[PDB]
Amino acid sequence: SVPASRYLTDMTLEEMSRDWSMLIPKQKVAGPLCIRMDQAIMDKNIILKANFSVIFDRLETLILLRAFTEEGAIVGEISPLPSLPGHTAEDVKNAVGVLIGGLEWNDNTVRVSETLQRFA
Amino acid sequence: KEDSVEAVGAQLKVYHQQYQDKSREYDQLYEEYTRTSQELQMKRTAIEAFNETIKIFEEQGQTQEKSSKEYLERFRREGNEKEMQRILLNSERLKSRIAEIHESRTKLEQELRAQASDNREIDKRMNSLKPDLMQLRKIRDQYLVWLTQKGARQKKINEWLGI
């Protein structure tokens, strides 16, 4: 029936590990998370994809979230700060709202993945 | 420090190999599973063919003793013992023949059920690998993200991964 443990991965290893750059860097520390977005991306359709675990039917831990344009380019990210001990599901939901908002300020249309719709 | 970075990188290497190994172990099982699963399908099919023949034979024995009761009413008054002992002998020919194919169905079915039961064991073994597979993948992904966050480029990540 319901596992009440899974690890959901929207991204391949290649996506997770790919090198990317922001033409106009915007960065904000959101508790234990780091939010990054290229201030130069505008009027695009963007898809937020994530790797994260769940327990119960609920998001538990983010591993990594990257923002991709329709052409597959990376223009934002949410990630745990390597220094530090972890985060809760709520830090995660707040970091996402903060990123969606940042990208909408610049006239991007922002969608999230289905796994995200479902748990986050 | 460039030492903490290589230590994590080395630790990434360890988890990735473990995950590749559990993952190969898992797929071996999956392939044995799907294979015996087809074999089971071929057995069930052969059993179905046993079933319809047996059907025919059963509804013939019941058809040759449904008239052999009323025709022990013309042959009631006798009583021959070289001829009367002979007309239920083809009733024994028919019983030994349903019995024999029953024996053969039952040996097929015994083999099928044992095989089915063996594949359920494989399914349990796989299902048992999942929590370690999941934990390992997640933990291998966290090391990778920590290395990205500390400045590792994809090429260096790929070298630690061994890809």
PDB file of C-alpha atoms in Angstrom:
ATOM      1  CA  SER A   1       0.000   0.000   0.000  1.00  0.00           C
ATOM      2  CA  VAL A   2       1.772   3.209   1.296  1.00  0.00           C
ATOM      3  CA  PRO A   3       5.531   2.701   1.955  1.00  0.00           C
ATOM      4  CA  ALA A   4       5.960   5.671   4.262  1.00  0.00           C
ATOM      5  CA  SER A   5       9.564   5.703   3.054  1.00  0.00           C
ATOM      6  CA  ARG A   6      10.730   6.708  -0.430  1.00  0.00           C
ATOM      7  CA  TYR A   7      13.453   8.633  -2.131  1.00  0.00           C
ATOM      8  CA  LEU A   8      12.022  10.627  -5.089  1.00  0.00           C
ATOM      9  CA  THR A   9      14.469  11.735  -7.719  1.00  0.00           C
ATOM     10  CA  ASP A  10      13.368  14.110 -10.545  1.00  0.00           C
ATOM     11  CA  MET A  11      16.911  14.730 -11.585  1.00  0.00           C
ATOM     12  CA  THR A  12      19.606  12.475 -13.086  1.00  0.00           C
ATOM     13  CA  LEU A  13      23.101  12.521 -11.635  1.00  0.00           C
ATOM     14  CA  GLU A  14      24.147  14.555 -14.683  1.00  0.00           C
ATOM     15  CA  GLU A  15      21.604  17.274 -13.812  1.00  0.00           C
ATOM     16  CA  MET A  16      22.545  17.247 -10.198  1.00  0.00           C
ATOM     17  CA  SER A  17      26.210  17.576 -10.861  1.00  0.00           C
ATOM     18  CA  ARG A  18      26.231  19.845 -13.924  1.00  0.00           C
ATOM     19  CA  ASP A  19      28.252  23.065 -13.790  1.00  0.00           C
ATOM     20  CA  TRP A  20      26.139  26.247 -14.117  1.00  0.00           C
ATOM     21  CA  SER A  21      26.599  30.002 -13.794  1.00  0.00           C
ATOM     22  CA  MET A  22      24.354  32.949 -13.074  1.00  0.00           C
ATOM     23  CA  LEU A  23      24.896  36.054 -15.351  1.00  0.00           C
ATOM     24  CA  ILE A  24      23.401  38.180 -12.514  1.00  0.00           C
ATOM     25  CA  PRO A  25      23.785  36.237  -9.258  1.00  0.00           C
ATOM     26  CA  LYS A  26      21.007  36.373  -6.651  1.00  0.00           C
ATOM     27  CA  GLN A  27      21.634  34.289  -3.495  1.00  0.00           C
ATOM     28  CA  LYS A  28      19.892  34.144  -0.147  1.00  0.00           C
ATOM     29  CA  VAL A  29      20.439  31.942   2.936  1.00  0.00           C
ATOM     30  CA  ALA A  30      17.078  30.573   4.026  1.00  0.00           C
ATOM     31  CA  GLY A  31      17.702  29.045   7.414  1.00  0.00           C
ATOM     32  CA  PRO A  32      19.713  25.919   6.742  1.00  0.00           C
ATOM     33  CA  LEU A  33      19.052  26.184   2.998  1.00  0.00           C
ATOM     34  CA  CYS A  34      20.720  28.169   0.265  1.00  0.00           C
ATOM     35  CA  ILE A  35      18.587  29.670  -2.600  1.00  0.00           C
ATOM     36  CA  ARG A  36      20.249  30.755  -5.788  1.00  0.00           C
ATOM     37  CA  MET A  37      18.722  32.385  -8.924  1.00  0.00           C
ATOM     38  CA  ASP A  38      19.981  34.105 -12.056  1.00  0.00           C
ATOM     39  CA  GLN A  39      18.522  37.605 -11.906  1.00  0.00           C
ATOM     40  CA  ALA A  40      18.977  37.755 -15.726  1.00  0.00           C
ATOM     41  CA  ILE A  41      16.425  35.112 -16.713  1.00  0.00           C
ATOM     42  CA  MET A  42      13.050  36.696 -17.816  1.00  0.00           C
ATOM     43  CA  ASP A  43       9.837  35.698 -19.614  1.00  0.00           C
ATOM     44  CA  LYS A  44      10.709  31.991 -19.596  1.00  0.00           C
ATOM     45  CA  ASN A  45       8.780  28.883 -18.659  1.00  0.00           C
ATOM     46  CA  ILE A  46      10.652  27.290 -15.775  1.00  0.00           C
ATOM     47  CA  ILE A  47      10.358  23.782 -14.250  1.00  0.00           C
ATOM     48  CA  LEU A  48      11.507  23.131 -10.595  1.00  0.00           C
ATOM     49  CA  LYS A  49      12.815  19.590 -10.224  1.00  0.00           C
ATOM     50  CA  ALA A  50      13.869  17.971  -6.985  1.00  0.00           C
ATOM     51  CA  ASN A  51      15.411  14.950  -5.224  1.00  0.00           C
ATOM     52  CA  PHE A  52      14.019  14.397  -1.780  1.00  0.00           C
ATOM     53  CA  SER A  53      12.793  11.829   0.578  1.00  0.00           C
ATOM     54  CA  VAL A  54       9.433  11.233   2.150  1.00  0.00           C
ATOM     55  CA  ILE A  55       8.164   9.557   5.274  1.00  0.00           C
ATOM     56  CA  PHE A  56       4.466   9.156   5.963  1.00  0.00           C
ATOM     57  CA  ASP A  57       2.971  10.836   2.892  1.00  0.00           C
ATOM     58  CA  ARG A  58       5.032  13.884   3.732  1.00  0.00           C
ATOM     59  CA  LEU A  59       8.277  15.569   2.468  1.00  0.00           C
ATOM     60  CA  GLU A  60      11.019  14.855   4.963  1.00  0.00           C
ATOM     61  CA  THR A  61      14.379  15.973   3.604  1.00  0.00           C
ATOM     62  CA  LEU A  62      15.433  17.859   0.541  1.00  0.00           C
ATOM     63  CA  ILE A  63      18.508  16.584  -1.175  1.00  0.00           C
ATOM     64  CA  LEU A  64      18.554  19.078  -4.080  1.00  0.00           C
ATOM     65  CA  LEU A  65      16.131  21.274  -6.162  1.00  0.00           C
ATOM     66  CA  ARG A  66      17.207  22.880  -9.499  1.00  0.00           C
ATOM     67  CA  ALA A  67      15.192  25.254 -11.781  1.00  0.00           C
ATOM     68  CA  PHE A  68      15.361  24.374 -15.441  1.00  0.00           C
ATOM     69  CA  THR A  69      14.195  26.341 -18.522  1.00  0.00           C
ATOM     70  CA  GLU A  70      12.290  24.548 -21.273  1.00  0.00           C
ATOM     71  CA  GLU A  71      15.590  24.218 -23.132  1.00  0.00           C
ATOM     72  CA  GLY A  72      17.142  22.374 -20.179  1.00  0.00           C
ATOM     73  CA  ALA A  73      19.278  25.155 -18.715  1.00  0.00           C
ATOM     74  CA  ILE A  74      19.772  25.580 -14.997  1.00  0.00           C
ATOM     75  CA  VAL A  75      18.843  28.946 -13.626  1.00  0.00           C
ATOM     76  CA  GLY A  76      18.238  28.402  -9.911  1.00  0.00           C
ATOM     77  CA  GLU A  77      18.775  25.995  -7.054  1.00  0.00           C
ATOM     78  CA  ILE A  78      17.818  25.188  -3.578  1.00  0.00           C
ATOM     79  CA  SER A  79      20.365  23.231  -1.549  1.00  0.00           C
ATOM     80  CA  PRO A  80      21.306  22.314   2.097  1.00  0.00           C
ATOM     81  CA  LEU A  81      24.266  24.243   3.377  1.00  0.00           C
ATOM     82  CA  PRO A  82      27.263  21.870   3.541  1.00  0.00           C
ATOM     83  CA  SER A  83      28.463  23.323   6.801  1.00  0.00           C
ATOM     84  CA  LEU A  84      25.484  22.562   8.866  1.00  0.00           C
ATOM     85  CA  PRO A  85      23.078  20.126  10.497  1.00  0.00           C
ATOM     86  CA  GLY A  86      19.905  19.604   8.551  1.00  0.00           C
ATOM     87  CA  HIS A  87      16.483  21.091   7.973  1.00  0.00           C
ATOM     88  CA  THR A  88      12.777  20.258   8.253  1.00  0.00           C
ATOM     89  CA  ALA A  89      10.062  19.899   5.602  1.00  0.00           C
ATOM     90  CA  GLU A  90       8.896  23.408   6.474  1.00  0.00           C
ATOM     91  CA  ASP A  91      12.175  25.112   5.670  1.00  0.00           C
ATOM     92  CA  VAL A  92      11.838  23.331   2.399  1.00  0.00           C
ATOM     93  CA  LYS A  93       8.301  24.554   1.624  1.00  0.00           C
ATOM     94  CA  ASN A  94       9.398  28.134   2.510  1.00  0.00           C
ATOM     95  CA  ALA A  95      12.525  28.035   0.403  1.00  0.00           C
ATOM     96  CA  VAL A  96      10.405  26.922  -2.623  1.00  0.00           C
ATOM     97  CA  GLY A  97       7.879  29.775  -2.202  1.00  0.00           C
ATOM     98  CA  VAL A  98      10.739  32.184  -1.923  1.00  0.00           C
ATOM     99  CA  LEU A  99      12.279  30.873  -5.187  1.00  0.00           C
ATOM    100  CA  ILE A 100       9.041  30.751  -7.215  1.00  0.00           C
ATOM    101  CA  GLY A 101       8.418  34.340  -6.145  1.00  0.00           C
ATOM    102  CA  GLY A 102      11.870  35.487  -7.130  1.00  0.00           C
ATOM    103  CA  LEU A 103      11.503  33.964 -10.605  1.00  0.00           C
ATOM    104  CA  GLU A 104       7.905  35.435 -11.033  1.00  0.00           C
ATOM    105  CA  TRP A 105       9.209  38.922 -10.237  1.00  0.00           C
ATOM    106  CA  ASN A 106      10.973  38.613 -13.584  1.00  0.00           C
ATOM    107  CA  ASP A 107       8.019  37.411 -15.502  1.00  0.00           C
ATOM    108  CA  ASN A 108       8.954  33.754 -15.571  1.00  0.00           C
ATOM    109  CA  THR A 109       6.163  31.262 -15.531  1.00  0.00           C
ATOM    110  CA  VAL A 110       7.045  28.730 -12.822  1.00  0.00           C
ATOM    111  CA  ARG A 111       5.925  25.133 -12.577  1.00  0.00           C
ATOM    112  CA  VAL A 112       6.991  22.474 -10.053  1.00  0.00           C
ATOM    113  CA  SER A 113       7.388  18.740 -10.699  1.00  0.00           C
ATOM    114  CA  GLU A 114       4.576  16.241 -10.043  1.00  0.00           C
ATOM    115  CA  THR A 115       6.514  14.583  -7.190  1.00  0.00           C
ATOM    116  CA  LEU A 116       6.718  18.087  -5.678  1.00  0.00           C
ATOM    117  CA  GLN A 117       2.972  18.786  -6.303  1.00  0.00           C
ATOM    118  CA  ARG A 118       2.180  15.528  -4.515  1.00  0.00           C
ATOM    119  CA  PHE A 119       4.348  15.809  -1.337  1.00  0.00           C
ATOM    120  CA  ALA A 120       5.608  19.365  -0.984  1.00  0.00           C
TER     121      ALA A 120
ATOM    122  CA  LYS B   1      40.559  22.941   3.153  1.00  0.00           C
ATOM    123  CA  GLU B   2      41.378  20.701   0.185  1.00  0.00           C
ATOM    124  CA  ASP B   3      41.679  17.683   2.564  1.00  0.00           C
ATOM    125  CA  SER B   4      38.123  17.720   3.803  1.00  0.00           C
ATOM    126  CA  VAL B   5      37.103  17.889   0.165  1.00  0.00           C
ATOM    127  CA  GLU B   6      39.083  14.801  -0.840  1.00  0.00           C
ATOM    128  CA  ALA B   7      37.869  12.883   2.163  1.00  0.00           C
ATOM    129  CA  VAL B   8      34.228  13.502   1.227  1.00  0.00           C
ATOM    130  CA  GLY B   9      35.084  12.723  -2.370  1.00  0.00           C
ATOM    131  CA  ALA B  10      36.607   9.416  -1.255  1.00  0.00           C
ATOM    132  CA  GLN B  11      33.601   8.756   0.846  1.00  0.00           C
ATOM    133  CA  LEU B  12      31.332   9.513  -2.150  1.00  0.00           C
ATOM    134  CA  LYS B  13      33.403   6.937  -4.075  1.00  0.00           C
ATOM    135  CA  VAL B  14      32.737   4.350  -1.388  1.00  0.00           C
ATOM    136  CA  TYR B  15      28.935   4.897  -1.351  1.00  0.00           C
ATOM    137  CA  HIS B  16      28.604   4.879  -5.119  1.00  0.00           C
ATOM    138  CA  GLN B  17      30.399   1.526  -5.476  1.00  0.00           C
ATOM    139  CA  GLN B  18      28.214   0.127  -2.705  1.00  0.00           C
ATOM    140  CA  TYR B  19      25.176   1.411  -4.489  1.00  0.00           C
ATOM    141  CA  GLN B  20      26.319   0.069  -7.833  1.00  0.00           C
ATOM    142  CA  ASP B  21      26.883  -3.312  -6.169  1.00  0.00           C
ATOM    143  CA  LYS B  22      23.504  -3.491  -4.361  1.00  0.00           C
ATOM    144  CA  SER B  23      21.895  -2.348  -7.552  1.00  0.00           C
ATOM    145  CA  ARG B  24      23.496  -5.141  -9.596  1.00  0.00           C
ATOM    146  CA  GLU B  25      22.516  -7.652  -6.942  1.00  0.00           C
ATOM    147  CA  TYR B  26      18.950  -6.299  -7.143  1.00  0.00           C
ATOM    148  CA  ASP B  27      18.683  -6.615 -10.961  1.00  0.00           C
ATOM    149  CA  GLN B  28      20.077 -10.179 -10.986  1.00  0.00           C
ATOM    150  CA  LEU B  29      17.183 -11.129  -8.712  1.00  0.00           C
ATOM    151  CA  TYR B  30      14.724  -9.147 -10.897  1.00  0.00           C
ATOM    152  CA  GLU B  31      15.857 -11.078 -13.992  1.00  0.00           C
ATOM    153  CA  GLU B  32      15.693 -14.510 -12.270  1.00  0.00           C
ATOM    154  CA  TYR B  33      12.223 -13.442 -11.033  1.00  0.00           C
ATOM    155  CA  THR B  34      10.815 -12.450 -14.436  1.00  0.00           C
ATOM    156  CA  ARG B  35      12.291 -15.607 -15.963  1.00  0.00           C
ATOM    157  CA  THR B  36      10.835 -18.205 -13.585  1.00  0.00           C
ATOM    158  CA  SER B  37       7.647 -16.112 -13.884  1.00  0.00           C
ATOM    159  CA  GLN B  38       7.374 -17.017 -17.580  1.00  0.00           C
ATOM    160  CA  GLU B  39       8.251 -20.693 -16.882  1.00  0.00           C
ATOM    161  CA  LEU B  40       5.384 -20.666 -14.338  1.00  0.00           C
ATOM    162  CA  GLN B  41       3.177 -19.364 -17.110  1.00  0.00           C
ATOM    163  CA  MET B  42       4.193 -22.276 -19.340  1.00  0.00           C
ATOM    164  CA  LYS B  43       3.510 -24.745 -16.544  1.00  0.00           C
ATOM    165  CA  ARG B  44       0.055 -23.313 -15.782  1.00  0.00           C
ATOM    166  CA  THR B  45      -0.772 -23.531 -19.473  1.00  0.00           C
ATOM    167  CA  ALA B  46       0.287 -27.205 -19.665  1.00  0.00           C
ATOM    168  CA  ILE B  47      -1.812 -27.857 -16.506  1.00  0.00           C
ATOM    169  CA  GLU B  48      -4.799 -26.274 -18.245  1.00  0.00           C
ATOM    170  CA  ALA B  49      -4.264 -28.805 -21.066  1.00  0.00           C
ATOM    171  CA  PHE B  50      -4.093 -31.634 -18.550  1.00  0.00           C
ATOM    172  CA  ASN B  51      -7.397 -30.271 -17.116  1.00  0.00           C
ATOM    173  CA  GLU B  52      -9.489 -30.494 -20.290  1.00  0.00           C
ATOM    174  CA  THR B  53      -8.343 -34.049 -21.181  1.00  0.00           C
ATOM    175  CA  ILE B  54      -9.042 -35.159 -17.586  1.00  0.00           C
ATOM    176  CA  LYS B  55     -12.480 -33.468 -17.929  1.00  0.00           C
ATOM    177  CA  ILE B  56     -13.245 -35.534 -21.035  1.00  0.00           C
ATOM    178  CA  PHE B  57     -12.137 -38.767 -19.288  1.00  0.00           C
ATOM    179  CA  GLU B  58     -14.126 -38.042 -16.132  1.00  0.00           C
ATOM    180  CA  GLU B  59     -17.330 -37.285 -18.082  1.00  0.00           C
ATOM    181  CA  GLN B  60     -16.899 -40.603 -19.913  1.00  0.00           C
ATOM    182  CA  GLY B  61     -16.354 -42.767 -16.848  1.00  0.00           C
ATOM    183  CA  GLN B  62     -19.512 -41.205 -15.391  1.00  0.00           C
ATOM    184  CA  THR B  63     -21.097 -41.964 -18.795  1.00  0.00           C
ATOM    185  CA  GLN B  64     -19.954 -45.622 -18.833  1.00  0.00           C
ATOM    186  CA  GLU B  65     -21.212 -46.344 -15.283  1.00  0.00           C
ATOM    187  CA  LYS B  66     -24.497 -44.461 -15.759  1.00  0.00           C
ATOM    188  CA  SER B  67     -25.502 -47.208 -18.206  1.00  0.00           C
ATOM    189  CA  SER B  68     -23.536 -50.046 -16.577  1.00  0.00           C
ATOM    190  CA  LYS B  69     -25.938 -49.911 -13.590  1.00  0.00           C
ATOM    191  CA  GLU B  70     -29.117 -50.382 -15.678  1.00  0.00           C
ATOM    192  CA  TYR B  71     -27.386 -53.147 -17.690  1.00  0.00           C
ATOM    193  CA  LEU B  72     -26.698 -55.068 -14.539  1.00  0.00           C
ATOM    194  CA  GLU B  73     -30.523 -55.508 -14.662  1.00  0.00           C
ATOM    195  CA  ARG B  74     -30.551 -57.622 -17.849  1.00  0.00           C
ATOM    196  CA  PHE B  75     -27.336 -59.375 -16.718  1.00  0.00           C
ATOM    197  CA  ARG B  76     -28.526 -59.604 -13.081  1.00  0.00           C
ATOM    198  CA  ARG B  77     -29.856 -63.142 -13.702  1.00  0.00           C
ATOM    199  CA  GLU B  78     -26.809 -65.374 -14.370  1.00  0.00           C
ATOM    200  CA  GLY B  79     -24.269 -65.645 -12.873  1.00  0.00           C
ATOM    201  CA  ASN B  80     -21.271 -66.220 -15.170  1.00  0.00           C
ATOM    202  CA  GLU B  81     -17.824 -65.988 -13.552  1.00  0.00           C
ATOM    203  CA  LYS B  82     -15.684 -65.982 -16.712  1.00  0.00           C
ATOM    204  CA  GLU B  83     -18.036 -63.469 -18.430  1.00  0.00           C
ATOM    205  CA  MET B  84     -19.761 -61.558 -15.566  1.00  0.00           C
ATOM    206  CA  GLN B  85     -16.429 -60.798 -13.794  1.00  0.00           C
ATOM    207  CA  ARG B  86     -15.298 -59.355 -17.161  1.00  0.00           C
ATOM    208  CA  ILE B  87     -17.793 -56.504 -17.762  1.00  0.00           C
ATOM    209  CA  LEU B  88     -16.595 -54.416 -14.786  1.00  0.00           C
ATOM    210  CA  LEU B  89     -12.993 -55.047 -15.862  1.00  0.00           C
ATOM    211  CA  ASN B  90     -13.240 -52.240 -18.438  1.00  0.00           C
ATOM    212  CA  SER B  91     -14.522 -50.164 -15.517  1.00  0.00           C
ATOM    213  CA  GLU B  92     -11.112 -50.899 -13.923  1.00  0.00           C
ATOM    214  CA  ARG B  93      -9.421 -49.990 -17.244  1.00  0.00           C
ATOM    215  CA  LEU B  94     -11.100 -46.615 -17.047  1.00  0.00           C
ATOM    216  CA  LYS B  95     -10.451 -45.994 -13.356  1.00  0.00           C
ATOM    217  CA  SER B  96      -6.729 -46.851 -13.582  1.00  0.00           C
ATOM    218  CA  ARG B  97      -6.552 -44.333 -16.471  1.00  0.00           C
ATOM    219  CA  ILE B  98      -8.176 -41.401 -14.770  1.00  0.00           C
ATOM    220  CA  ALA B  99      -6.035 -42.214 -11.709  1.00  0.00           C
ATOM    221  CA  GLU B 100      -2.869 -42.270 -13.862  1.00  0.00           C
ATOM    222  CA  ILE B 101      -3.404 -38.893 -15.449  1.00  0.00           C
ATOM    223  CA  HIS B 102      -4.395 -37.493 -11.986  1.00  0.00           C
ATOM    224  CA  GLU B 103      -1.032 -38.725 -10.771  1.00  0.00           C
ATOM    225  CA  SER B 104       0.556 -36.861 -13.698  1.00  0.00           C
ATOM    226  CA  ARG B 105      -1.445 -33.664 -13.235  1.00  0.00           C
ATOM    227  CA  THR B 106      -0.621 -33.678  -9.497  1.00  0.00           C
ATOM    228  CA  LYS B 107       3.104 -34.099 -10.116  1.00  0.00           C
ATOM    229  CA  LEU B 108       3.014 -31.109 -12.528  1.00  0.00           C
ATOM    230  CA  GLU B 109       1.021 -29.068 -10.073  1.00  0.00           C
ATOM    231  CA  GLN B 110       3.282 -30.060  -7.198  1.00  0.00           C
ATOM    232  CA  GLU B 111       6.304 -28.821  -9.259  1.00  0.00           C
ATOM    233  CA  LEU B 112       4.431 -25.593 -10.238  1.00  0.00           C
ATOM    234  CA  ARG B 113       3.467 -24.721  -6.679  1.00  0.00           C
ATOM    235  CA  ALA B 114       6.982 -25.350  -5.398  1.00  0.00           C
ATOM    236  CA  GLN B 115       8.363 -23.120  -8.174  1.00  0.00           C
ATOM    237  CA  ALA B 116       5.812 -20.402  -7.525  1.00  0.00           C
ATOM    238  CA  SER B 117       6.836 -20.569  -3.906  1.00  0.00           C
ATOM    239  CA  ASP B 118      10.486 -20.220  -4.791  1.00  0.00           C
ATOM    240  CA  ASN B 119       9.742 -17.020  -6.876  1.00  0.00           C
ATOM    241  CA  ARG B 120       7.821 -15.464  -3.942  1.00  0.00           C
ATOM    242  CA  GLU B 121      11.127 -15.978  -2.037  1.00  0.00           C
ATOM    243  CA  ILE B 122      13.020 -14.028  -4.706  1.00  0.00           C
ATOM    244  CA  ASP B 123      10.433 -11.238  -4.507  1.00  0.00           C
ATOM    245  CA  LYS B 124      11.008 -11.111  -0.746  1.00  0.00           C
ATOM    246  CA  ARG B 125      14.773 -10.937  -1.261  1.00  0.00           C
ATOM    247  CA  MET B 126      14.389  -8.018  -3.664  1.00  0.00           C
ATOM    248  CA  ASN B 127      11.858  -6.272  -1.421  1.00  0.00           C
ATOM    249  CA  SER B 128      14.456  -6.618   1.312  1.00  0.00           C
ATOM    250  CA  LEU B 129      17.136  -4.833  -0.691  1.00  0.00           C
ATOM    251  CA  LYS B 130      15.000  -1.740  -1.254  1.00  0.00           C
ATOM    252  CA  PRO B 131      15.619   0.034   2.069  1.00  0.00           C
ATOM    253  CA  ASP B 132      19.372  -0.296   1.703  1.00  0.00           C
ATOM    254  CA  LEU B 133      19.164   0.732  -1.961  1.00  0.00           C
ATOM    255  CA  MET B 134      17.104   3.804  -1.103  1.00  0.00           C
ATOM    256  CA  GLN B 135      19.323   4.827   1.842  1.00  0.00           C
ATOM    257  CA  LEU B 136      22.489   4.402  -0.169  1.00  0.00           C
ATOM    258  CA  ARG B 137      21.289   6.335  -3.217  1.00  0.00           C
ATOM    259  CA  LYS B 138      20.096   9.212  -1.035  1.00  0.00           C
ATOM    260  CA  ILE B 139      23.334   9.259   0.952  1.00  0.00           C
ATOM    261  CA  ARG B 140      25.438   9.013  -2.228  1.00  0.00           C
ATOM    262  CA  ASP B 141      23.365  12.062  -3.582  1.00  0.00           C
ATOM    263  CA  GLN B 142      24.005  14.084  -0.365  1.00  0.00           C
ATOM    264  CA  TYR B 143      27.791  13.652  -0.682  1.00  0.00           C
ATOM    265  CA  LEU B 144      27.591  14.710  -4.307  1.00  0.00           C
ATOM    266  CA  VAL B 145      25.596  17.862  -3.352  1.00  0.00           C
ATOM    267  CA  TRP B 146      28.009  18.661  -0.522  1.00  0.00           C
ATOM    268  CA  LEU B 147      30.877  18.484  -3.054  1.00  0.00           C
ATOM    269  CA  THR B 148      29.098  20.718  -5.578  1.00  0.00           C
ATOM    270  CA  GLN B 149      28.371  23.186  -2.778  1.00  0.00           C
ATOM    271  CA  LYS B 150      32.070  23.260  -1.877  1.00  0.00           C
ATOM    272  CA  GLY B 151      33.087  24.059  -5.419  1.00  0.00           C
ATOM    273  CA  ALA B 152      33.534  20.723  -7.142  1.00  0.00           C
ATOM    274  CA  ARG B 153      33.011  20.801 -10.903  1.00  0.00           C
ATOM    275  CA  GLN B 154      31.219  18.040 -12.749  1.00  0.00           C
ATOM    276  CA  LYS B 155      34.482  16.625 -14.112  1.00  0.00           C
ATOM    277  CA  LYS B 156      35.890  16.154 -10.600  1.00  0.00           C
ATOM    278  CA  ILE B 157      32.547  14.712  -9.398  1.00  0.00           C
ATOM    279  CA  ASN B 158      32.638  12.247 -12.287  1.00  0.00           C
ATOM    280  CA  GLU B 159      36.165  11.158 -11.335  1.00  0.00           C
ATOM    281  CA  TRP B 160      35.113  10.343  -7.765  1.00  0.00           C
ATOM    282  CA  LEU B 161      32.117   8.469  -9.103  1.00  0.00           C
ATOM    283  CA  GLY B 162      34.421   6.563 -11.398  1.00  0.00           C
ATOM    284  CA  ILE B 163      32.444   7.795 -14.459  1.00  0.00           C
TER     285      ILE B 163
END
